[PDB]
Enzyme design. Structure first.
Site, PDB file in Angstrom:
ATOM      1  N   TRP A  37       0.848  -1.181   0.000  1.00 21.22           N
ATOM      2  CA  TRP A  37       0.000   0.000   0.000  1.00 21.22           C
ATOM      3  C   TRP A  37       0.892   1.241   0.000  1.00 21.22           C
ATOM      4  O   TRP A  37       1.909   1.273   0.683  1.00 21.22           O
ATOM      5  CB  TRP A  37      -0.881  -0.002   1.244  1.00 21.22           C
ATOM      6  CG  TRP A  37      -1.932   1.076   1.261  1.00 21.22           C
ATOM      7  CD1 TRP A  37      -3.255   0.929   0.982  1.00 21.22           C
ATOM      8  CD2 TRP A  37      -1.741   2.467   1.585  1.00 21.22           C
ATOM      9  NE1 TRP A  37      -3.915   2.143   1.108  1.00 21.22           N
ATOM     10  CE2 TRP A  37      -3.006   3.101   1.473  1.00 21.22           C
ATOM     11  CE3 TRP A  37      -0.623   3.237   1.962  1.00 21.22           C
ATOM     12  CZ2 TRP A  37      -3.181   4.478   1.718  1.00 21.22           C
ATOM     13  CZ3 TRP A  37      -0.798   4.601   2.207  1.00 21.22           C
ATOM     14  CH2 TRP A  37      -2.070   5.207   2.083  1.00 21.22           C
ATOM     15  N   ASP A 106       6.599  -3.684   0.854  1.00 21.50           N
ATOM     16  CA  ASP A 106       5.724  -3.039   1.846  1.00 21.50           C
ATOM     17  C   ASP A 106       4.944  -4.109   2.647  1.00 21.50           C
ATOM     18  O   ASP A 106       5.563  -5.023   3.207  1.00 21.50           O
ATOM     19  CB  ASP A 106       4.811  -2.086   1.061  1.00 21.50           C
ATOM     20  CG  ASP A 106       3.979  -1.188   1.925  1.00 21.50           C
ATOM     21  OD1 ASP A 106       4.505  -0.188   2.439  1.00 21.50           O
ATOM     22  OD2 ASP A 106       2.765  -1.428   2.023  1.00 21.50           O
ATOM     23  N   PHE A 107       3.608  -4.011   2.679  1.00 16.57           N
ATOM     24  CA  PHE A 107       2.737  -4.982   3.378  1.00 16.57           C
ATOM     25  C   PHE A 107       3.050  -6.413   2.956  1.00 16.57           C
ATOM     26  O   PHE A 107       2.994  -7.337   3.779  1.00 16.57           O
ATOM     27  CB  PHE A 107       1.266  -4.720   3.055  1.00 16.57           C
ATOM     28  CG  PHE A 107       0.558  -3.846   4.048  1.00 16.57           C
ATOM     29  CD1 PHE A 107       0.444  -4.234   5.390  1.00 16.57           C
ATOM     30  CD2 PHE A 107      -0.047  -2.655   3.639  1.00 16.57           C
ATOM     31  CE1 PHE A 107      -0.273  -3.445   6.316  1.00 16.57           C
ATOM     32  CE2 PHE A 107      -0.765  -1.854   4.547  1.00 16.57           C
ATOM     33  CZ  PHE A 107      -0.881  -2.248   5.890  1.00 16.57           C
ATOM     34  N   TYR A 140      -1.732   8.110   9.590  1.00 15.04           N
ATOM     35  CA  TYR A 140      -2.594   7.537   8.562  1.00 15.04           C
ATOM     36  C   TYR A 140      -3.161   6.167   8.913  1.00 15.04           C
ATOM     37  O   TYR A 140      -4.295   5.875   8.555  1.00 15.04           O
ATOM     38  CB  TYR A 140      -1.898   7.530   7.189  1.00 15.04           C
ATOM     39  CG  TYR A 140      -0.538   6.875   7.172  1.00 15.04           C
ATOM     40  CD1 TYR A 140       0.610   7.609   7.448  1.00 15.04           C
ATOM     41  CD2 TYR A 140      -0.399   5.517   6.871  1.00 15.04           C
ATOM     42  CE1 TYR A 140       1.862   7.013   7.425  1.00 15.04           C
ATOM     43  CE2 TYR A 140       0.846   4.908   6.850  1.00 15.04           C
ATOM     44  CZ  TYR A 140       1.975   5.658   7.128  1.00 15.04           C
ATOM     45  OH  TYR A 140       3.218   5.050   7.129  1.00 15.04           O
ATOM     46  N   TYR A 203      -5.074  -1.904   7.274  1.00 12.27           N
ATOM     47  CA  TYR A 203      -4.601  -1.215   8.468  1.00 12.27           C
ATOM     48  C   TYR A 203      -5.509  -1.600   9.623  1.00 12.27           C
ATOM     49  O   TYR A 203      -5.041  -1.911  10.706  1.00 12.27           O
ATOM     50  CB  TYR A 203      -4.609   0.306   8.274  1.00 12.27           C
ATOM     51  CG  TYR A 203      -3.480   0.791   7.407  1.00 12.27           C
ATOM     52  CD1 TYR A 203      -2.225   1.056   7.948  1.00 12.27           C
ATOM     53  CD2 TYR A 203      -3.648   0.929   6.030  1.00 12.27           C
ATOM     54  CE1 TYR A 203      -1.156   1.443   7.137  1.00 12.27           C
ATOM     55  CE2 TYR A 203      -2.591   1.314   5.210  1.00 12.27           C
ATOM     56  CZ  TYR A 203      -1.346   1.568   5.769  1.00 12.27           C
ATOM     57  OH  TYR A 203      -0.294   1.917   4.961  1.00 12.27           O
ATOM     58  N   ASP A 234      13.276   9.234   2.236  1.00 15.00           N
ATOM     59  CA  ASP A 234      13.191  10.670   2.148  1.00 15.00           C
ATOM     60  C   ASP A 234      14.075  11.302   3.259  1.00 15.00           C
ATOM     61  O   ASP A 234      14.385  12.500   3.203  1.00 15.00           O
ATOM     62  CB  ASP A 234      11.743  11.144   2.312  1.00 15.00           C
ATOM     63  CG  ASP A 234      10.883  10.208   3.162  1.00 15.00           C
ATOM     64  OD1 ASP A 234      10.678   8.995   2.777  1.00 15.00           O
ATOM     65  OD2 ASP A 234      10.360  10.634   4.262  1.00 15.00           O
ATOM     66  N   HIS A 263      10.767   4.712  -0.879  1.00 13.50           N
ATOM     67  CA  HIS A 263       9.988   3.512  -0.575  1.00 13.50           C
ATOM     68  C   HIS A 263       9.606   2.615  -1.778  1.00 13.50           C
ATOM     69  O   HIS A 263       9.403   1.407  -1.621  1.00 13.50           O
ATOM     70  CB  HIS A 263       8.728   3.947   0.196  1.00 13.50           C
ATOM     71  CG  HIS A 263       8.000   2.820   0.868  1.00 13.50           C
ATOM     72  ND1 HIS A 263       8.566   2.057   1.869  1.00 13.50           N
ATOM     73  CD2 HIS A 263       6.752   2.325   0.676  1.00 13.50           C
ATOM     74  CE1 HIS A 263       7.696   1.142   2.264  1.00 13.50           C
ATOM     75  NE2 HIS A 263       6.591   1.282   1.555  1.00 13.50           N
TER      76      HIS A 263
HETATM   77  K   LIG Z   1      10.220  13.115  -1.669  1.00 11.84           K
END
Ligand SMILES: [K+]
Length: 282
Positions: A37, A106-107, A140, A203, A234, A263
């Protein structure tokens, strides 16, 4: 750069538990590419073609995402990462594939952690890409617990676009991850019925205090060769805990950080993604 969704060979199978949509192409040992996600199977679009020259590339939408089925939105037991891992075994079964190389992002890195343990005999080698999301219980993950969030984010394309653009950009090393066209493809997917809620359910079902994210089996050790790779992000340094805990559950692995990458490795640094996979999976 762009290779639109319609430019791939699509498929949909009814698995015993759920209906799964996947894209497939190429020849050679099977390569299962799993998204996380935000997004869907398409995040791998830049890397599928090149990898297809050496592998039978299979890229499915996880349950609750893309064109895959969105199980009962009120039944969170159907949105556990455990189910997503089972779906991968079921997919390979339906396609008569005994063993496959697996890449989880990720997930899906969690799905992969679960899968390599529950279905150890079904994997040749595995690779984990950016398992940890940047700002983590994040604002989030909590926001996604609310129905108001579903109602707001999915209220219009304008809103949905602004919301997801933030994560694509903020989670990337460079200022903008996607082109206007590519972002529009994601908005098309996000606006499909139940896709916003389906993603948020991941989530609600897994990223919660009372939510059982790990099983007894997940705590066991794996000798399976795993390739861990993540971008410096970042910023830098939230991956420290991973670096310490990994050796406690993995005996055969490698770790690598990609400078000037966020990411989405397969999106921001396609070439690096392809290279790393081709070297490790042979
Ligand atoms: K960025």
């Amino acid at each position: 750069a762009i290779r639109r969704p319609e430019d791939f060979k699509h498929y949909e199978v009814q698995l015993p538990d759920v209906k799964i949509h996947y894209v497939r192409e190429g020849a050679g040992p099977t390569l299962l590419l799993l998204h996380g996600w935000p997004g869907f199977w398409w995040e791998w679009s830049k890397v599928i073609g090149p990898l297809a020259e050496h592998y039978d590339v299979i890229v499915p939408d996880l349950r609750g995402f893309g064109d895959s089925e969105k199980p009962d939105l009120n039944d969170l037991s159907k949105y556990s990462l455990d189910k997503a891992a089972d779906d991968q075994a079921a997919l390979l079964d339906a396609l008569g594939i005994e063993k496959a190389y697996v890449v989880g992002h990720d997930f899906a890195a969690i799905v992969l952690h679960k899968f390599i343990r529950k279905y150890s005999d079904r994997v040749i080698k595995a690779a984990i890409f950016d398992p940890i999301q940047p700002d983590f219980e994040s604002w989030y993950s909590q926001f996604h617990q609310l129905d108001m969030a579903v109602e707001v984010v999915g209220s219009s394309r304008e809103v949905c676009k602004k919301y997801f653009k933030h994560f694509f950009d903020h989670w990337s090393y460079r200022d903008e991850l996607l082109t206007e066209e590519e972002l529009e493809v994601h908005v098309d997917n996000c606006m499909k019925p139940d896709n916003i809620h389906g993603g948020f359910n991941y989530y609600r079902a897994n990223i919660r205090p009372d939510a059982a994210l790990w099983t007894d089996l997940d705590h066991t050790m794996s000798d399976l060769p795993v390739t861990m790779i993540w971008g410096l992000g970042d910023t830098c340094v939230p991956y420290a805990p991973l670096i310490e805990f990994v050796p406690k559950y993995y005996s055969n692995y490698t770790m690598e950080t990609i400078e000037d990458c966020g990411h989405f490795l397969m999106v921001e640094k396609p070439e690096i993604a392809i290279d790393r996979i081709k070297t490790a999976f042979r």
